[PDB]
Write a protein that binds this ligand. Structure first.
Ligand code: HEM
Length: 146
């Protein structure tokens, strides 16, 4: 897990992002796809389609919303190793079955801090908290077998 201090920093940088969950969640998904084109191919609904096609999709909102809803829960429980345990297991389990592995999460991690900063400057120490959080997710995926 993260420490309470770290978790707070993550929550603090997340708030402005989560404040506009619909628009920001769609944006994160679009940015991912733009920076890491292979990612879309894991999605049944988006495989083959271009970013414009994805933006125009009536399915986009369903996807991006479930993602932000779960990220919000990770931010919320981050400092509790116990909840993280279960959360990480279950998340990894789920993703692996779809063929997603740690490398895709290494990509999310790379682009995350820059995405948050495009919404509002994060507090000092927040970027490191996110990379640690994503670090925990990456580890989970590896244990999950990918
Ligand atoms: C940024 C962190 C992300 C979060 C919080 C997140 C969250 C989730 C959630 C909550 C589910 C639905 C689980 C279910 O209903 O059983 C899901 C499904 C899935 N996610 Fe993620 N995800 C993350 C990033 C990714 C990445 C990077 C990819 C691929 C590169 C991905 C690929 C998938 C796929 C392929 C599904 C199956 C759902 C479908 O398309 O029908 N996720 N994800």
């Amino acid at each position: 897990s993260l420490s309470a201090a770290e978790a707070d920093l993550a929550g603090k940088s997340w708030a402005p992002v989560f404040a506009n969950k619909n628009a920001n969640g769609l944006d994160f998904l679009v940015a991912l796809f733009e920076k890491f084109p292979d990612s879309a191919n894991f999605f049944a609904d988006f495989k083959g389609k271009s970013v414009a096609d994805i933006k125009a999709s009536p399915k986009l909102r369903d996807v991006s919303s479930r993602i932000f809803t779960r990220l919000n829960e990770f931010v919320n429980n981050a400092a509790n190793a116990g909840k993280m345990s279960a959360m990480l297991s279950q998340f990894a389990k789920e993703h692996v079955g779809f063929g997603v592995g740690s490398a895709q999460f290494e990509n999310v991690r790379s682009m995350f801090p820059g995405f948050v900063a495009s919404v509002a400057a994060p507090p000092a120490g927040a970027d490191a908290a996110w990379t640690k959080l994503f670090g925990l997710i990456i580890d989970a995926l590896k244990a999950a077998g990918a």
